[PDB]
Amino acid sequence: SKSRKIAILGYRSVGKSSLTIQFVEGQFVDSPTIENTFTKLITVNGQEYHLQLVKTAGQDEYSIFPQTYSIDINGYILVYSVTSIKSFEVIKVIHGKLLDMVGKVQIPIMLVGNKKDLHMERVISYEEGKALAESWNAAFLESSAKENQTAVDVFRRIILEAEKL
Ligand SMILES: Nc1nc2c(ncn2[C@@H]2O[C@H](COP(=O)(O)OP(=O)(O)O)[C@@H](O)[C@H]2O)c(=O)[nH]1
């Protein structure tokens, strides 16, 4: 089995913890906001993976980008909320500072718009975030931390993008 380490980046309250618990624990529960690493076995294309999932502390436009992430990470999930215009604007900034940090080592990157279950609360269309991912040449998905199958699909997509390198 292979070992891979995945950093989950994003603004606060966009659902980094909830997506990662929905994937690791199989369930949607609460009870962090402080960085935490989760382990998880998964098979992608018949290949077994040991995953260290780093759910980061949550970054704003000003919070410095930590180098530690760059040093050992194999893929980055950038999550925003489809109910928060601020988190979408923040993920653009996060992306530039992460490219500023690894330089241009063509590292697996993926954009996720979370909370797609909140139909009445949506302010960002699917197409708006899909255009953003394509201008980055990154994979795009909309997820809901209430729906296990969209959580699982985010995490096996970032490993798919990692095998391609
Ligand atoms: N309805 C809905 N609520 C969510 C979703 N993801 C997170 N939440 C809620 O939004 C808040 C987000 O908190 P959290 O998951 O810790 O986000 P984090 O700060 O980025 O780690 C919590 O109250 C969650 O219950 C989702 O997909 N759908």
Numbering used by the authors: 4 to 34, 37 to 170
Provide text from the study:
Mammalian target of rapamycin complex 1 (mTORC1) serves as a central regulator of cell growth and proliferation by integrating signals from growth factors, nutrients, energy status, and cellular stress. A small GTPase, called Ras homolog enriched in brain (Rheb), is a positive regulator of mTORC1. Like other small GTPases, the function of Rheb is dictated by its guanine nucleotide binding states: it is active in the GTP-bound form and inactive in the GDP-bound form. The Y35N mutant assumes a very similar overall structure as the WT Rheb with a typical small GTPase protein fold composed of a six-stranded β-sheet surrounded by four α-helices.
On the other hand, the D60K mutant was shown to be unable to bind to Mg2+ or the nucleotide (either GTP or GDP) and hence to assume a nucleotide-free form; thus, it is regarded as a dominantly inactive mutant and widely used as a negative control in the functional study of mTORC1 activation (Tabancay et al., 2003). In contrast, the dominantly inactive D60K mutant cannot activate mTORC1 in the presence of either GppNHp or GDP. To investigate the molecular basis for the incapability of the D60K mutant to activate mTORC1, we determined the crystal structure of D60KGDP at 2.6 Å resolution. Surprisingly, there is a GDP bound at the active site of the D60K mutant with clearly defined electron density, even though no GDP was added in the protein purification and crystallization processes, which is in disagreement with the previous functional data showing that the D60K mutant assumes a nucleotide-free form. Nevertheless, consistent with the previous functional data, there is no Mg2+ bound at the active site (Tabancay et al., 2003). Intriguingly, attempts to co-crystallize the D60K mutant with GppNHp failed to yield any crystals. In the D60KGDP structure, the long, positively charged side chain of Lys60 is extended into the Mg2+-binding site, which not only hinders the Mg2+ binding owing to electrostatic repulsion but also expels the side chain of Thr38 away from the active site, to adopt a conformation similar to that seen in WTGDP but different from that seen in Y35NGDP. In addition, distinct from all known WT and mutant Rheb structures, in the D60KGDP structure, a portion of switch I (residues 35 and 36) is disordered.
